Amino acid sequence: AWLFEA
Amino acid sequence: AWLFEA
Amino acid sequence: AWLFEA
Amino acid sequence: AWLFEA
Amino acid sequence: MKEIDELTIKEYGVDSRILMERAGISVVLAMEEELGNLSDYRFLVLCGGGNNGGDGFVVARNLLGVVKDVLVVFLGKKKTPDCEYNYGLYKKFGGKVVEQFEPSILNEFDVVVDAIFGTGLRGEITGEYAEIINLVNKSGKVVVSVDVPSGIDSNTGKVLRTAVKADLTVTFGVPKIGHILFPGRDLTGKLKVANIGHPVHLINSINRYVITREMVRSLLPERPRDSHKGTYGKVLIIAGSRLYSGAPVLSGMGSLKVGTGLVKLAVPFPQNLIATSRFPELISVPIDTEKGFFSLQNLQECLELSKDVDVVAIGPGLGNNEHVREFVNEFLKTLEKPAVIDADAINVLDTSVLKERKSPAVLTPHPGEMARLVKKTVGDVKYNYELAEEFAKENDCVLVLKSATTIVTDGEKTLFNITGNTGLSKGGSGDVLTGMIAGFIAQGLSPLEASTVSVYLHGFAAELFEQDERGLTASELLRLIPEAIRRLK
Amino acid sequence: MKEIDELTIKEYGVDSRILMERAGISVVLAMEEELGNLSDYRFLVLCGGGNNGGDGFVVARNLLGVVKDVLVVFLGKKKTPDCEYNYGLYKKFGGKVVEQFEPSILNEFDVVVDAIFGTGLRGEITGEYAEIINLVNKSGKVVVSVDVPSGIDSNTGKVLRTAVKADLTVTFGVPKIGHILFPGRDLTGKLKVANIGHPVHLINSINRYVITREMVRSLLPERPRDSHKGTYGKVLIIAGSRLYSGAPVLSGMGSLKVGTGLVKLAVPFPQNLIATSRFPELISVPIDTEKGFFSLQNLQECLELSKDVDVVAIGPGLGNNEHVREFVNEFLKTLEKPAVIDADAINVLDTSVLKERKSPAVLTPHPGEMARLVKKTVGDVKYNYELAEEFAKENDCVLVLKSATTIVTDGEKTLFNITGNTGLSKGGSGDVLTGMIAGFIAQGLSPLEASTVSVYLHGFAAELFEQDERGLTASELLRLIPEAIRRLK
Amino acid sequence: MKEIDELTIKEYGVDSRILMERAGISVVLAMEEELGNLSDYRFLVLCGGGNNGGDGFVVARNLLGVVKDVLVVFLGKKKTPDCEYNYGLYKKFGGKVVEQFEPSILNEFDVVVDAIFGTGLRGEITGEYAEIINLVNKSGKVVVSVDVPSGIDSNTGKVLRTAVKADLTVTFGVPKIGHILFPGRDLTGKLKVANIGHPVHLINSINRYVITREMVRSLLPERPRDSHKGTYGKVLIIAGSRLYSGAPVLSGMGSLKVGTGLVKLAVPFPQNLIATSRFPELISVPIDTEKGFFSLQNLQECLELSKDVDVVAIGPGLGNNEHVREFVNEFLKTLEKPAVIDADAINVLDTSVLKERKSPAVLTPHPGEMARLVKKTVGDVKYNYELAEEFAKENDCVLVLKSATTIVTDGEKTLFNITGNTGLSKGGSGDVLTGMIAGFIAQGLSPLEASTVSVYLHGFAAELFEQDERGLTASELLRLIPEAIRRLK
Ligand SMILES: Nc1ncnc2c1ncn2[C@@H]1O[C@H](COP(=O)(O)O)[C@@H](O)[C@H]1O
Ligand SMILES: Nc1ncnc2c1ncn2[C@@H]1O[C@H](COP(=O)(O)O)[C@@H](O)[C@H]1O
Ligand SMILES: Nc1ncnc2c1ncn2[C@@H]1O[C@H](COP(=O)(O)O)[C@@H](O)[C@H]1O
Ligand SMILES: Nc1ncnc2c1ncn2[C@@H]1O[C@H](COP(=O)(O)O)[C@@H](O)[C@H]1O
Ligand SMILES: Nc1ncnc2c1ncn2[C@@H]1O[C@H](COP(=O)(O)O)[C@@H](O)[C@H]1O
Ligand SMILES: Nc1ncnc2c1ncn2[C@@H]1O[C@H](COP(=O)(O)O)[C@@H](O)[C@H]1O
Ligand SMILES: [K+]
Ligand SMILES: [K+]
Ligand SMILES: [K+]
C-alpha cells in the first residue's frame, strides 16, 4: 500500500 | 490433436 | 500399449 | 529479488 | 472425398497401400482410446471385398499377437487390389479367415469390427449381408465401424434397408454427410475423424462443414469497452396476435440475451402488454388492429418503426389469414432492411417478393414450413441439403432449415449444426432462435454468420440445462444462453 | 533387427514404404505425447540420405500444415529409394528443403528432429556432419532422434567421434544395444519403442533382452502359506577377514531380505561377532585362523558346513593372498553345491577349476575383476557382452558383469539391467547383490533366473531411497529391498 | 563498502542524495513486508548526525501522512550535509523533531527505527546515547535498525559497550562483517540487504562473502550415470585410540554420506571393530599398537595404506601424547596426498611441517585448538578472520575455523558460514565435518571448495532435525545429510 495505489 | 478430430 | 513400449 | 537479498 | 483419395494418390503420389495402412492403424488407436488396453478382448472383423474391407484386413493384421483372439469373416466374392494385398498380409502374419458366418459365432468374441461396406455402397442391402447385420445389432457386443456404419449411404444419412448400429465409428479425413444427418448420425455412435495423410489443402477445400466451437468463437462480435447500446444495434420484432401472445416475448429476449443493444416489439394491443410485464427491459409497442391480427392498416406504422432499426424479425405468432398475408408481403416488399422471416411469415410468403428485395433475408423454416413453401412433401425436403442450397441461391437468401441437425446455407457455403437435444422439441424454442439471429445481425454479423453462431449457441444452451432435457422450456433456455456464450470462451 | 526389416519385407511381403511411413508417424505421435499439442512449435528436421533420413522426410511431411513451421536440411549426397520417394512427397506436399546448414538456423526453430544417421552408421563422424551435431548439442533446443541418436554405434553404445544428445529417442521394434549401453544410453534421453508392423514372432525371436518388471514379477518364487524356513532354502556365506569385517554382514542380509529361510556365515574369529551384533537373526560361525584369513587349514571345516546348505557364496572381504588362493581353489574344486563367486574369490580364481566343477556357479565381477580374470584391459571388457558370452559358455557358468548397465549371460541368453543409480557406486553394494543371488538360488531359481531377478531388484531398491542418491549406503539399501519386492507386485 | 559509496558517487556520478533516498525507502519497504500495512502503527525514529541519521530522516519523511504518528528524536550535535538536507525536507513536509529524549516517550509509539549510528561508529558508546539504547532494549517495542544496529562495530561484530537489539535490520549493497559474526549477528535480528543503486561490478568485487545455497548448489560434483565407486574417490581416515573409539566411525560415515566411493579407516585394534559393527559398509583396518595409540611403529603401515587413496583425514580421537606427535608429524611430512587435519592431529602439529609439504592441507580447528596452535588466547583468535587469513597464507593451506559462524579461508578468499544451530554443540559433530571435507576432496573438489560445501551442508543438516535441536546427536546428523543435499536441489 505504501508504494502503489491499484 | 494430430491423429484425431472429435 | 499397442504403439509404444516405454 | 530486485530490491532485496534475504 | 472420393476425389480426395484419388488426387492424393494420382497427383500427390501417395501409394494407396499407405493410405490403407494409415486408415487401419487409426482404427486400432481409436479402439485403444475407447476400450483401454486391448489385450483382454477377442475381435471379430467382418470384411467385404472393397477398400473398406481392406481397411479391416489391416486392423485384423495389426491386432495379431497383441490381443486375445482375432478372426476375419470375409463376406465378399472378389477383392479389390488393395483389399487383396492386405488379405495376403493377414494370412502371412498367421491370421485366420473364414467365409461362412455362423449365427453363434458372435458368442466367442467381445468386439465386432464392421468393415463390410463404406462410402462404396450403392442400393439396398439384402440376403446374407442383411442377416449378418441384423445378427450383430441383436448381439449386444461392442461395435466399431470402419468409415461409416455399413448400410448408411454416406451422401444422405439414409439407411439402405438395414444398417449397423456402432458404438464407435472411425472415419478418415473429414466427417461425411452420412455421419451428420439422421438416421445415420444416430447409427455412427461416437465419431472420430482420423488424419490418414491427405494434404491439408485438400481437406480444407471441402465445400460443406460442421459448425464447431472454434468456428463460432472466432465469429462472436467484439465488445469494445467504450460502447453504448447503439454500438450493439437495434432490432424490431413484428409478431404476435390475439391467439399467440407469447411468441414476441421469447423472440425479443432471444435478441437481448445475445448482446443486442435495443429490442422493440410491435404486437397487437393489449397482447403487447404481456411482454413488458414479463421482461420490462423490452420495448413493446401496441399496434391497434381490427380483430387481433396485423393487416395492411398497420403497414405504414410498421415501416415507420423500422426506419430507426438495423434488422427486422417477422412471423412468430402472427397467425395465417389473408389480411396477415397481404401485410407480410407488402411489408417485405417495401422494407429496405435485413429481414429474418420465421413461422407464419413463411406460411404466407410470396417467394417472388424475396427475389425483388434488394436487402438481405434469412428464412428459418422447419420441414413442414419448408414443404409448404416449395410445395413438396415433408419427406422430400427433410435433410435435403441440395434443395436448401438451390432455394437459397435462387432467392438470394440464407436458409436455415431446422431439425435435430440444422442446415444453414446461402447457396455457396453449407453448414451443419449438431448441438442441441430433444428439449428444444417444444413450442417456442424456434421463437428464441429467430431473435438470436436478428440480434446477431444487428451487431454487424452477416446473415450467414449470424445464423451459424445462433443455431450453434441455441443448441449448446439446451445442453447446459441441469435437469432432464425433456423438461426444458424456452424460458429456461433464454436463461442458459449467456452461459453458453461464456463457455464458448 | 536389420534382418528383421529384411524378412518383414522380403518374406512377409510388407512394402518397405509402409514400414517407413509407420516409423515416421510413430515419431510424430511420440513428440505429441512428450511435448503436448505440436501446433505451437517450429521444427527443423535434419535428414541424411539413408533410410533414417527417409523416416525424417515422413515426419516432416506429416507436420506440414499442422505446426507453425517446418524445414528440412538435407545433408546427404545420394538418397536411397525409400528416402527418395519420401523426399518427393515432402516436396509435393509443399515442404521446404535446403542443402546448406547455416549456424544461425537453430535460431528460428524450437525442435530439432535428428534423422541424420541411424543403425546404418559405420565409422567416425567428421567434417560438416560433426560440425552440425556440435551445433545442435550447443543449441539448447529440444532434440528428438529417429531410431538412435546420430553418432551412436547401435551395436555397442559407443560414440563415433561425436554424437547427438537427444531429449527423446523413438526407436522401432526393439531397443537396440546402443540405447542400452553407455555412453549411448545417456545420449538417448527418454526412449520410446514403437511397433511399426513387424510380425510379433520376429520381434520375440531376438536373442538379447532388457530385464523388465514383468519378467521379474513372473520369476519371483511363490510363498506357499504352509511353509517353514527349510522351504525357502539355506545359504552359507564364506567371507571376511581381519581387514574386512563388514562384507559378511551385508551379504548375509542380502540373502535374508530376499526371503531365504536360513543364512549361515563362516567368518574368522572374532570378526564373526560383528555380524550378530548388528543382525542377530544371522548365524555367524567363528573360523579359527592363523593370521585373520582363511587358509587350507579351514578347508575341512567349510566343506562340513556346506553339506547342510543349498548354495554357497564366497569371496567378499576374504583378502587376496596365497593362502586364500589355495583355500578358495581347493574349496570350489571339492564343493558339490552351486557357488556364487564374488570379489576376492574371483581375484584368486583358477578358471580351470570352473570347467572341472559338475555343480553350477555364478561369477559376479566388476570390470576391474573381469579384466584381471581374463587378462585384458578394463577398456576391452567393459560393456563387452560378446566377451561375457564367450566366457560363460567356455566355463559353463553364469556371468554377471556389474556396471551402470549390468550384463547377465549364460552363453546362450543375454540380459541387460537398467535399474539403479549412482548411489550404488559405493563399497558394499556389491556385497548385498552376492547375497541376493545366493538367496534366490536357495529358494529354487536357476542361477540365471536368480541373477536376473537380483540385479533388477538391487537397482530398483536404490531408486526407492527417499533422499539424494549420493547419500545411499548398503545398510539403507538392505532396508529398501522388501519395498522393491512389494512394488514389483 | 565505504569505498563503494565513494566510488559510486565520485567516479560513477550518482548524487549522494540519491543513494540516501534509495536507502531510506528500502527501509520503508522492508518494514511493510515485515509488519504488513503500516498505517496502523506509530513510529519513533532516532537519528544521529551522520549519514545513518540522514537515512532516518528519509524514512521519517516518507512515513508522513501515511502512518498514524511519526516523531524524530535527533540526538547528534552537528549534521553532515546529506543528513542536513534531509532534516530540512522532513521539516518542510511538516514532520515533528525534538532533541530531548524522555524515558516515557517509548510509551506512545509502536515501532522504534534506530538510525543513531551505522558503519560510521568508532569507540565505545557512553552517556545519553547508551541510556537511550538501554531504554529501547527494555521497551519491548519492535525495533528496525538502519544499516547495522547502533553499537555494533561493522568490521568485527563486537558490541561497543552497548548496542541495539533489532527485530529487523536493513543494510545496503552487501551484508557487513558485523551482521555475520557474533554477538552482532544476534543483535541484527532478521537481515535484509537492499540494492540502493551501486553498480553491480562494485558489489561483486567484495573479497569476502557469505556461503549461500546458490553457491553450494553450483559446487556440488556431478553424478554421471556411467560411474563406479572409483569415480567418486577413496578416503583414508587415520583415527581413534583406546580412549576414543567413536570418532573414526563418525568421520568415516561423514565421507560416505556425501557420496564418496570408498572409505577406509585405520584404527588401533580392537577399537577398529566398533566401526564395522555399527556401519559394515566401512572398511576398518586394525592397527597393532603397543598401548592403544598410534606411534612411529605404525608409520610405514599408514603410508602404505595411503598410496591407494585420494585424500587422508587424520586426528579425531588420536589422543595427544609424545608418540602420537612423532607419528603425526613424520606422517604428514612424508604423505604426498591432500591431508585434512583435525582435532588431536592439530594439537600435536608442528607448523614447519605444513610449509615444507608440497601437497595441500585443510586444517579444521575450533578456537581452543586455534589458540594453542598459534599460541594466543581464545579471545584473540575467536572470530578473528584476518588472523585466519594470515595463517592460511603463511602455511599454504585452507583454514576452517569452527564456530556458530565458521570462517573458511585460503588467504585470498574468505567465506562465512551461517547455517547450523546449537545441536552441533556436542562432541562428535566436528568428526562428521572432517569426513565430509575429505569426501568432497576425494570427489575432485579443491580444498577450499570441499570446505565451503561441507560447512554449509553440515549446518543445514542440523536444521533439518525434526525435534528440539538440543537433542541432536552426530548419528542423527549423519542420517540428515542426504536430505540436506536433496534440499539443496
Ligand atoms: N456513450 C455514447 N457514446 C457515443 N454516442 C452515444 C453514447 N450514448 C448515446 N450516444 C448517441 O446518442 C444516440 C442514441 O444513443 P443509443 O441510445 O446508444 O442508440 C446515438 O445516435 C449515439 O450517437
Ligand atoms: N431433437 C432435437 N435436437 C436438436 N434440436 C432440436 C430438436 N428438436 C427441435 N430442435 C430445434 O429447436 C427449434 C425448433 O423450432 P420450431 O421447429 O420453429 O418449433 C429448432 O431450432 C430446431 O432445430
Ligand atoms: N512346519 C514344518 N513342516 C514340515 N517340516 C518341518 C517344519 N518345520 C520343521 N520341519 C522339518 O524339520 C527340519 C528342520 O526344519 P527347518 O528348520 O525348517 O529347515 C526339516 O528337515 C523339516 O522337514
Ligand atoms: N564400472 C566400471 N567402469 C570402469 N572401470 C571400473 C568399473 N568398476 C571397476 N573398475 C576398475 O576396477 C578398478 C577398481 O574399481 P573401483 O572398485 O571402482 O575403484 C579401477 O581401477 C577401475 O578402473
Ligand atoms: N552408477 C551406477 N548405476 C547403477 N548401478 C551401479 C552404479 N554403480 C555401481 N552400480 C552397481 O552397484 C554394484 C557395485 O558392486 P561392486 O562393483 O562389487 O562394488 C554393482 O551391482 C553395480 O552394477
Ligand atoms: N551453536 C552452534 N551453531 C552452529 N554451529 C555450531 C554451533 N556449535 C558448534 N557448531 C559447529 O559444530 C562443529 C563442532 O566441532 P568441534 O568444535 O570440533 O567439536 C563445528 O562444525 C562448529 O562450527
Ligand atoms: K463399415
Ligand atoms: K538419428
Ligand atoms: K543504526
Q: Can you tell me the distance from the alpha carbon of G196 to that of G4, in angstroms, rounded to the nearest whole number?
A: 12
- State whether E89 and F15 contact (CB < 8 Å): no
CA of B3 to the centre of ligand 8 (A): 24
Could you please report the per-residue DSSP string of E181-223? STTHHHHT-EEEEE--S--HHHHHH-SEEE--HHHHHHHSPP-
Q: Give the residue carrying C-alpha cell 528436421.
A: F45
Specify whether the CB–CB gap between E443 and E489 falls below 8 A. Answer: no
Total length of chain A = 6
Q: How far is CA E149 from the centre of its chain?
A: 19
DSSP state of E152: B
Closest residue CA from atom 19 of ligand 6: G430
| Grid coordinates belonging to F90 | 515432402
- Classify residue F3 as exposed, middle or buried by CB count within 10 Å of its CB (0-12, 13-18, 19+): exposed
> Please, what are the domains in chain F?
1-206 (3.40.50.10260), 207-489 (3.40.1190.20)
Compute the CA torsion angle G24, G29, G33, G36 (nearest 10 deg).
Answer: 100
Q: Can you tell me the distance from the alpha carbon of F59 to that of F64, in angstroms, rounded to the nearest whole number?
A: 9
Distance from CA of E91 to the nearest CA of C (A): 20
CA of E484 to the centre of ligand 1 (A): 29
Q: Can you tell me the distance from the alpha carbon of G301 to that of G286, in angstroms, rounded to the nearest whole number?
A: 11
Q: Give the residue carrying C-alpha cell 563388514.
A: F246
Residue G243, number of CB atoms within 10 A of its CB: 12
- Cα(first)–Cα(last) distance of chain C, in Å? 9
Q: Can you tell me the distance from the alpha carbon of F209 to that of F213, in angstroms, rounded to the nearest whole number?
A: 12
User: Which residues, in sequence order, are bridge partners of residue F339?
Assistant: F312, F361
- State whether A1 and G28 contact (CB < 8 Å): no
Q: Can you tell me the distance from the alpha carbon of G188 to that of G405, in angstroms, rounded to the nearest whole number?
A: 14
Q: Can you tell me the distance from the alpha carbon of G22 to that of G169, in angstroms, rounded to the nearest whole number?
A: 16
| Contacts for G473 with CB less than 8 Å, ≥ 6 apart | G426, G428
Per-residue burial over F191-227, b if 16 or more Cβ lie within 10 Å, else e, is bbbbbbbbbeebbeeeebbbbeeeebeebbbeeeeee
Portion 178-207 of G in contact with A at CB < 8 A: none
Q: Which residues of E touch F89 (CB under 8 A)?
A: 12-14
User: Which residues, in sequence order, are bridge partners of residue F172?
Assistant: F194
Q: E196 vs E117, E193, F22, G255, CA distance in Å? A: 19, 9, 11, 60
Q: Can you tell me the distance from the alpha carbon of E29 to that of C3, in angstroms, rounded to the nearest whole number?
A: 8
Residue G88, number of CB atoms within 10 A of its CB: 13
DSSP state of G152: B
Q: How far is CA F318 from the centre of its chain?
A: 28
DSSP state of E2: H
Q: Which residues of C touch E38 (CB under 8 A)?
A: 1-2
Q: Give the residue carrying C-alpha cell 531504554.
A: G135
Q: Is F26 left (phi over 0), alpha (psi -120 to 50) or beta?
A: alpha
| Dihedral sign, Cα of residue F145, residue F146, residue F151, residue F154 | positive
**Which ligand is closest in space to the CA of residue G225?**
5
Q: Which residues of E touch B6 (CB under 8 A)?
A: 191-193
- State whether D6 and G30 contact (CB < 8 Å): no
Q: Can you tell me the distance from the alpha carbon of F74 to that of F79, in angstroms, rounded to the nearest whole number?
A: 10
The three-state DSSP-derived secondary structure of chain F is: CHHHHHHHHHCCCCCHHHHHHHHHHHHHHHHHHHHCCHHHCEEEEEECCCHHHHHHHHHHHHHCCCCCEEEEEECCCCCCHHHHHHHHHHHHCCCCEECCCCHHHHHHCCEEEEECCCCCCCCCCCHHHHHHHHHHHHHCCEEEEECCCCCECCCCCCECCCCCCCCEEEEECCCCHHHHCCCHHHHCCEEEEECCCCCHHHHHHCCEEECCHHHHHHHCCCCCCCCCHHHHCEEEEECCCCCCCCHHHHHHHHHHHCCCCEEEEEEECCCHHHHHHHCCCCEEEEECCCCCCCCHHHHHHHHHHHHCCCEEEECCCCCCCHHHHHHHHHHHHHCCCCEEEEHHHHHCCCCHHHHHCCCCEEEECCHHHHHHHHCCCHHHHCCCHHHHHHHHHHHCCEEEECCCCEEEECCCCEEEECCCCHHHCCCCHHHHHHHHHHHHHHCCCCHHHHHHHHHHHHHHHHHCCCCCHHHCCHHHHHHHHHHHHHHHC
Q: F379 vs F375, F382, F383, F425, CA distance in Å? A: 12, 5, 9, 18
Specify whether the CB–CB gap between E285 and E272 falls below 8 A. Answer: yes
Q: Give the residue carrying C-alpha cell 547528534.
A: G76
Taking the Cβ of residue F30 and every Cβ of chain C, the question of whether any pair is shorter than 8 Å is answered with yes
> Which atom of ligand 1 lies nearest, measured to the CA of E234?
19
Within E375-464, strands assigned E span: 398-401, 406-409, 414-417
| Dihedral sign, Cα of residue E194, residue E198, residue E199, residue E203 | negative
Q: Can you tell me the distance from the alpha carbon of E379 to that of G191, in angstroms, rounded to the nearest whole number?
A: 85
Q: Can you tell me the distance from the alpha carbon of G282 to that of G278, in angstroms, rounded to the nearest whole number?
A: 9
Q: Is the peptide bond before E175 cis (omega within 30 degrees of 0)?
A: no
Q: Can you tell me the distance from the alpha carbon of E222 to that of F292, in angstroms, rounded to the nearest whole number?
A: 91
**Gyration radius from chain E CA atoms:** 26
Closest residue CA from atom 14 of ligand 2: E430
CA angle F447, F451, F456 (to 5 degrees): 160
Closest C-alpha to F75, from F25, F115, F122, F120? F115
Largest CA distance in chain C: 11
- State whether E30 and B5 contact (CB < 8 Å): no
Total length of chain B = 6
Say whether E370 sits in a helix, a strand or coil: helix
| Grid coordinates belonging to F473 | 549406503
E470 lines ligand 1 (CB under 6 A): no
Closest residue CA from atom 5 of ligand 3: F228
Taking the Cβ of residue E26 and every Cβ of chain B, the question of whether any pair is shorter than 8 Å is answered with yes
F229 lines ligand 3 (CB under 6 A): yes
Question: To probe the interface with B, which of E29, E176, E195 has the most B CB atoms within 10 Å?
Answer: E195
CA of G435 to the centre of ligand 5 (A): 23
Neighbours of chain B (3+ CB pairs under 8 A): E, F
Closest residue CA from atom 23 of ligand 4: F368
Q: Which residues of F touch G486 (CB under 8 A)?
A: 467-468
F94 lines ligand 3 (CB under 6 A): no
Helix E299-307 crosses helix E322-334 at what angle (to 10 degrees)? 40
Q: Can you tell me the distance from the alpha carbon of G433 to that of G403, in angstroms, rounded to the nearest whole number?
A: 12
Q: Give the residue carrying C-alpha cell 423438461.
A: E471
Q: Can you tell me the distance from the alpha carbon of F411 to that of F399, in angstroms, rounded to the nearest whole number?
A: 9
Q: F1 vs F173, F205, G279, G409, CA distance in Å? A: 8, 10, 48, 59
Task: Collect residues with CB below 5 Å from ion ligand 9.
Answer: G 114, 145-146, 150
Q: F119 vs F50, G137, G195, CA distance in Å? A: 10, 77, 56
What residues of G are designated binding site?
Answer: 52, 114, 129, 147, 150, 317, 402-406, 421-431
| Grid coordinates belonging to G345 | 592431529
Query: For this experimental structure, what is the resolution in angstroms?
Result: 2.4
Taking the Cβ of residue F211 and every Cβ of chain C, the question of whether any pair is shorter than 8 Å is answered with no
F284 is known to lie in a ligand binding site: no
Q: Which residues of G touch D4 (CB under 8 A)?
A: 26, 30, 192-195
Say whether G145 sits in a helix, a strand or coil: strand
Specify whether the CB–CB gap between F139 and F105 falls below 8 A. Answer: no
Closest C-alpha to E141, from E120, E176, E166? E166
Closest CA in chain B for residue F63: B2
Closest residue CA from atom 23 of ligand 1: E230
- State whether G273 and F278 contact (CB < 8 Å): no
Q: Can you tell me the distance from the alpha carbon of F330 to that of F327, in angstroms, rounded to the nearest whole number?
A: 5
Closest C-alpha to G53, from G152, G163, G150, G186? G150
E308 lines ligand 1 (CB under 6 A): no
Closest residue CA from atom 13 of ligand 2: E430
Q: How far is CA E374 from the centre of its chain?
A: 21
